[PDB]
Write a protein that binds this ligand. Structure first.
Ligand SMILES: COc1cnc2c(NCc3nnc4ccc(-c5ccccc5)nn34)ccnc2c1
Length: 280
């Protein structure tokens, strides 16, 4: 039940645009397309206000209602081609655009697809643009990784796994202390505080993932021994196909001083330049 009085008065009129009527959504519970700690996701067919059939992914939270709605309201207002949108909430079901090619990590690990170095850098550029948008909205992601970005039918990469879509979709990479330690900035491992600058650290690791086509970072390090490993004066090595200036970008993302790491705007600029030097 929706109690409009419990909400922030400013946000009441935004409820009609976030709530999806149960008669407008068909969800196919016979086919699981993704698994999270909070719940499974399924295929869905959504009907528009006019009556157009759009394909969607419907996530369950199986495994405050006022708070849940405001979270959805804030997320719906986010609109960028490199950020996963919220279609709405159904009575609770989270309704998201269907991403045909799944998560970025699995996509680049797939033997049937063959992205070129240019393509891989382009995927990186797309993530940087999505994060530039999010950071301008003062939104800290906290869990940027290749596993947490998705691709649609046009191979458009979108920053996902945030707001109501947030979950652990690959439990292997989360350690109790439940943190994604191998994507975390030194200061975050120490304080558990996450910033846009710690998102920038995670982006550098994401770039390394792209250039290795989805290799696991720091395989021979065990969980929280990562802080010891890093403080020995170590960084992830330069992947074979990674251009030198792109590795220089990665090293900047992993600067020991958070305030010295590049903004996402600078990452878009630097990476767009490197991307432009390649053909095919
Ligand atoms: C074709 O298969 C799928 C599966 N899941 C979704 C989906 N899931 C919710 C979601 N929101 N943000 C994220 C980030 C990562 C994953 C994820 C899912 C599986 C493995 C690894 C990571 N899922 N996810 C949303 C939209 N389209 C999808 C299409």
């Amino acid at each position: 039940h929706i109690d409009l009085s419990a909400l922030n008065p400013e946000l009441v009129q935004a409820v009609q645009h976030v709530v999806i009527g149960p008669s407008s959504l068909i969800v196919h519970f016979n086919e699981v397309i993704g698994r999270g700690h909070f719940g499974c996701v399924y295929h869905g067919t959504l009907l528009d206000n006019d009556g157009k059939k759009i394909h969607c992914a419907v996530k369950s939270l199986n495994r405050e209602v006022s708070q849940f709605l405001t979270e959805g309201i804030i997320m719906k207002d986010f609109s960028h081609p490199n950020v996963l949108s919220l279609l709405g909430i159904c009575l609770p079901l989270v309704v998201l655009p269907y991403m045909k090619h799944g998560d970025l990590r699995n996509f680049i690990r797939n033997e049937t697809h063959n992205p070129t170095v240019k393509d891989l850098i382009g995927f990186g550029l797309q993530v940087a643009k999505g994060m530039k948008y999010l950071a301008s909205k003062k939104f800290v992601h906290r869990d940027l990784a290749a596993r947490n970005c998705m691709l649609d039918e046009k191979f458009t990469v979108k920053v996902a796994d945030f707001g109501l879509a947030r979950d652990m979709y690959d439990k292997e990479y989360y350690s109790v202390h439940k943190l994604p330690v191998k994507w975390m900035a030194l200061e975050s491992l120490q304080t558990q505080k996450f910033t846009t600058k710690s998102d920038v650290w995670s982006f550098g690791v994401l770039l390394w993932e792209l250039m290795t086509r989805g290799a696991p970072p720091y395989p021979d390090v065990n969980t929280f021994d990562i802080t010891v490993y890093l403080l020995q004066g170590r960084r992830l090595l330069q992947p074979e196909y990674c251009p030198d200036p792109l590795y220089e970008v990665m090293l900047k993302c992993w600067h020991p001083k958070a305030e010295m790491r590049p903004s996402f705007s600078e990452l878009v600029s630097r990476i767009s330049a490197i991307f432009s030097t390649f053909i095919g």
